[PDB]
Symmetry: C5
Subunit: 117 residues, 5 copies
């Protein structure tokens, strides 16, 4: 697996506006929310030691909190349908956070595309 | 367990005003105090490798110190009665810190509620 | 053991003015010095993986550097007579750093008392 | 191996302008891009626990994020042809980030040279 | 071994002006350079998992970058002759970075002397 696999999905030019940290089944996690210029929203969580994407927890937490601080538009890479506990999904999201990138415009960001072919 | 379990409890729109760090029984811990809009205090502690919320010590420590620094109003998620050692509970609190969120208002915050259901 | 044990000691309303990091016996350590408004001085060191207080090294280092940075008055919790290598005691202190707290006044600070 | 080995290569006086963070094969990696002025581009990635240069991940992550933040001109030490997963190389680079230095001019920087004879 | 052992050496009132980070033989290292007002110069490296001073790499890294950022005059504790690989010594230095202190003056700084 790779952040840049040809899959859903990515949102570009988002400002990270909300941040949550919790624990579930002995695993710390965090979630972010961001809006695009046009008002469109994306949420994604990263959980320590959980899923394929568990290895990225610390790096993503650090980078997410950095970008939440600067408030610069970034690209959120995510994978839908990873989290399955229904209370969790309802309150938050099923989307795993799978990478992050700075952006030069609202559509053009540094790094791979993550789109279904 | 889960931060968002329908249990006590949460305090929304809290400003983290006080920060303490210590050690008990070979385990580092930190405690925070925050104020709500009307002047009431909340306190909650996280302890490394403790009972059920110990796995979140590092994340919570970093996030709480971060929010202390910004002075942002935030949601404190806690579980009452976790710490049982009387001198500790007396000086500090029995509350474990189990989560944190940013808030859009003094009352509306990102993430799950941590709240007991009502009886209809 | 506990930071809040009824033991020596604590200094409240201290601004951390000095900071030192080094190594002894394959362990990193740090020391801080601070003065109260009253000019009364306090030094205390934390050592990584040390006997009793070593589990706290990482949190205390983080918090102490943080407090050194803001310049805010804080409570220094300490245990005297912990470090014993004589050249180390002589140059620095025997005091272990055992906790830290923010303060509201020169005497009132968040957290427990540490006093006999 | 050593950052300052006489091989390809280094780019001096680079301002880091782009930052990307992702995961591949159970490993977090970050990737940076900078401009010399000059005006030409260098990208390099570091990856946690990667084979040769993985020991340096956490140090380089910190240091690169630091330098991205200050915007100061820095030396990027790189090793070409390290990353080999072709879609990764295509979207990003094959270059491993193997060192960083502060610079006094566009060309003069602290530390070893990394260049072939 | 100790930062405060009666050996070479230390330079007081040094502003850390240059910073380098790299890897050699599967170990990360960083090096700093600084000048002390009269313009006398000092270089020192810390390397993770080296036989003697390796334990303090990440603490010294953190502290030195912190001091590079504030630009305050500090004390550099070093031990000469630690790095032996000749191209490394030629490009950088043989000096191990052994400790760091805040300073109150260009000559007086917090902590032990490291003096032969
Ligand atoms: O189709 C999806 C599903 O995640 N995402 C696309 C994404 C979304 O359709 C769009 O951002 C929603 O507003 O648009 C992109 O232009 C982008 O934001 O980078 C490309 C991206 O593939
Ligand atoms: O009743 C409790 C027990 O913790 N908590 C409630 C809590 C407290 O009653 C209140 O914060 C204390 O004044 O009020 C809430 O409006 C909130 O702050 O989110 C709802 C929350 O469920
Ligand atoms: O006597 C000692 C020895 O540490 N400490 C006391 C301490 C010192 O006497 C005082 O701070 C020294 O100036 O005064 C306290 O009011 C405080 O600073 O919190 C109470 C504390 O027990
Ligand atoms: O030839 C290469 C291949 O990395 N790089 C050289 C590099 C390139 O010629 C230059 O950066 C243009 O890409 O110039 C240097 O002056 C430098 O930037 O330090 C020396 C460096 O060895
Ligand atoms: O002899 C050495 C070898 O490092 N260093 C001395 C050192 C150097 O001679 C001096 O810093 C070089 O300008 O001067 C000191 O005043 C100091 O800077 O603390 C004392 C120190 O022991």
């Amino acid at each position: 697996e790779w952040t840049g696999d040809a899959r859903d999905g990515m949102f570009s030019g988002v400002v990270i506006t909300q941040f949550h940290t919790g624990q579930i089944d002995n695993k710390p996690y965090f979630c972010i929310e961001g809006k695009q210029s046009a008002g469109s929203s994306i949420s994604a969580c990263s959980m320590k030691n959980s899923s394929v994407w568990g290895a990225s927890f610390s790096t993503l937490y650090n980078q997410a909190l950095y970008f939440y601080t600067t408030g610069q538009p970034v690209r959120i890479y995510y994978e839908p349908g990873v989290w399955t506990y229904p209370p969790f999904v309802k309150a938050l999201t099923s989307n795993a956070l799978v990478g992050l990138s700075t952006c030069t415009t609202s559509t053009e960001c540094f790094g791979p595309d993550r789109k279904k072919n």
